[PDB]
């Protein structure tokens, strides 16, 4: 899915993205900005809006799971199996009509929140590698969702 160079860039910058809170703050900003920009998504998640307490709670769980996916990146089948299981659980989440179309704008909010945290370290190579990693992580979740 990712080249060895891309996996090494993702693994390296993940230390800076995780910070001291296992990426919790990045998760809150990712989902906050996503729902503010796409207000119709609040109903899909089951939140009142961008300021719902649940946004910060769920943002931390998303980023903690990406941290687990990053630790398994060198074994593709292992990473895919885990995320596929997360995907199967999403059949019963929110409005229970989570669509594949929703994951691409979420990816854009995620990379923006990562950049907001690590600044200049989120350079062109870092953005390409994380766009590739997000494609595979969310692609594996979507396959579980649609299984
Ligand atoms: C726009 C697409 C998405 C929607 C609408 C969505 C929705 C939800 C909802 C509503 C919950 C709360 C479940 C509960 O009440 O317990 C949840 C949990 C979770 N989501 Fe998502 N999600 C999406 C994308 C993602 C992505 C990309 C990841 C990837 C890391 C992810 C990882 C998780 C995790 C780790 C949980 C916690 C529960 C579990 O492990 O299954 N979600 N999601
Ligand atoms: C998913 N939150």
From Swiss-Prot:
PANTHER family: BLR2807 PROTEIN, GEO09476P1. Belongs to the globin family. X-ray crystallographic analysis indicates that the D helix is absent, Leu-58 replaces the distal His (of myoglobin E7), His-90 binds covalently to the heme iron, the F helix has several more residues than in mammalian globins, and Pro-105 (G7) causes a bend in the G helix. Heme b binds at residue 90. Monomer. Residues 1-146 form the Globin domain. The record marks 105 as: Causes a bend in the G helix. CDD domains: Mb-like. The keyword Metal-binding applies. Keywords: Heme, Iron, Metal-binding, Oxygen transport, Transport. This is Globin, major monomeric component. GO terms for molecular function: heme binding; metal ion binding; oxygen binding; oxygen carrier activity. SUPFAM superfamilies: Globin-like.
